[PDB]
């Protein structure tokens, strides 16, 4: 989807 | 060799300021930005004609959902990072690159790295499939995401599917942007100060980045007593640069900058014309 | 204490869009890099007083984590006028000022 959301730390 | 590269570059920080959002992402077409989410402006927005003309609504609202996803997850993140470095209240930074390039034989390279702070928290490469975390903090992370499998089959799903492919459409729908040549307008300038005549060769306007930019005295290159200026961006997509000698001012006529780039079919050659 | 602290200090170039033709309109930008934390007092100046219209483009940064920024205004060069960049960060003990160097 071109961005994505980064992952949670 | 690297064709075309596609990369975003996340700004989240916890306290907004004049010309700091909250956060800010920017897209990036082979080093030229295409792309913006702001969550002062709460909207992904087009930065060239071509993404405007070739992208379809679904296109702005999905991303726009993407960045205020984002917003949501480096503000988590920021309180999350913030409790465990032990830090009080202010200015912190999360920082984002990731993205892929496609190469000469048909391979795709891609990684996504994150700062905290200004340093190295954590970092995926396709290659090895694993985090590389920075210090005992990130390896926190790291653990849970390599003890879960999901976080690693997400990002190389995106870095070695998505991404490229995304990439392919960017450079099908700006061929006419990225593939354009604009050779530097090139003049030299000189100055006498303390007896030194220092002279510049300054070169303007040109894309893409790529230049050479050298002063010579007689048949060498005098890069020894040479200072080059960056390649730095204007404000219309195009970029700057110079390079600087100090001269005797009863010699000027023995110094002279060659300067090439793609879009000159010939090499030209500049001397100070006072 | 600020010696010790250059590495995330700005590195700062003024330049135009295009060689300056005296009384013909141009852009004078101010590149600003190397940067961090990323609050920064960036002033465009015209024999030392604000120009109208400056427009400050969005953070980015590099391969260390140094935030950059491109500041950028229309300006109309003359020989007779001088083109500052001061900028003020909290890395710096004091605001530098920055000259355009006049290419005509």
């Known amino acids: 989807m071109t961005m994505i959301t980064p992952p949670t730390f | ?274 | 204490y600020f010696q010790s602290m250059a590495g995330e200090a700005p590195k700062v170039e003024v330049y135009a869009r295009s060689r300056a033709e005296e009384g013909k309109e141009n852009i004078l930008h101010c590149f600003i890099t190397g940067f961090h934390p990323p609050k920064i007092d960036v002033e465009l100046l015209k024999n030392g007083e604000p120009m109208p219209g400056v427009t400050y483009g969005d953070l980015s940064f590099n391969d260390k984590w140094q935030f950059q920024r491109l500041v950028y205004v229309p300006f109309i060069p003359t020989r007779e006028d001088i083109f500052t960049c001061r900028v003020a960060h909290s890395t710096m003990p004091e605001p530098r000022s920055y000259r355009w160097e006049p290419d005509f």
């Not at chain 2, 991303?63 to 202010?90: C, D, F, K, P």
């Not at chain 2, 390279?109 to 905290?116: H, I, K, L, V, W």
């Not at chain 2, 995304?166 to 030299?188: A, F």
Request: proline fraction near 6%; charged fraction near 25%; include cysteine.
């Open chain 2, 1 to 274: 060799m690297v064709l075309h590269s596609l990369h975003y570059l996340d700004v989240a920080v916890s306290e907004p300021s004049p010309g700091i959002p909250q956060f800010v992402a920017m897209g990036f077409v082979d080093g030229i930005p295409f792309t913006r989410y702001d969550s002062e402006r709460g909207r992904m927005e087009p930065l060239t004609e071509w993404i405007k003309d070739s992208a379809d609504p679904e296109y702005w609202d999905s991303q726009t959902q993407i960045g205020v996803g984002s917003q949501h997850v480096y503000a988590r993140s920021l309180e999350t990072l913030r409790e465990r470095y032990n830090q009080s209240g202010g200015l912190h930074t999360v920082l984002r690159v990731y993205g892929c390039e496609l190469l000469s034989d048909g391979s795709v390279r891609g990684s996504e790295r994150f700062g905290y702070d200004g340093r190295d928290f954590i970092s995926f490469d396709l290659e090895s499939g694993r985090f590389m975390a920075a210090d005992s903090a990130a390896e926190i992370t790291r653990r849970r995401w390599e003890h879960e499998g999901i976080v690693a089959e997400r990002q190389t799903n995106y870095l070695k599917h998505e991404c490229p492919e995304w990439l392919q459409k960017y450079v099908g729908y700006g061929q006419k942007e990225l593939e354009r040549k604009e050779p530097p307008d090139v003049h030299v300038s000189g100055k006498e100060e303390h007896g030194t005549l220092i002279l510049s060769c300054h070169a303007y306007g040109f894309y893409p980045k790529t230049i050479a930019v050298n002063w010579m005295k007689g048949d060498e290159i005098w890069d020894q007593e040479t200072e080059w200026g960056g390649v730095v961006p204007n404000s219309d997509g195009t970029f700057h640069t110079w390079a600087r000698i100090e001269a005797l001012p009863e010699e000027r006529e023995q110094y002279r900058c060659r300067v090439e780039h793609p879009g000159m079919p010939e090499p030209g050659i500049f001397a100070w014309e006072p």
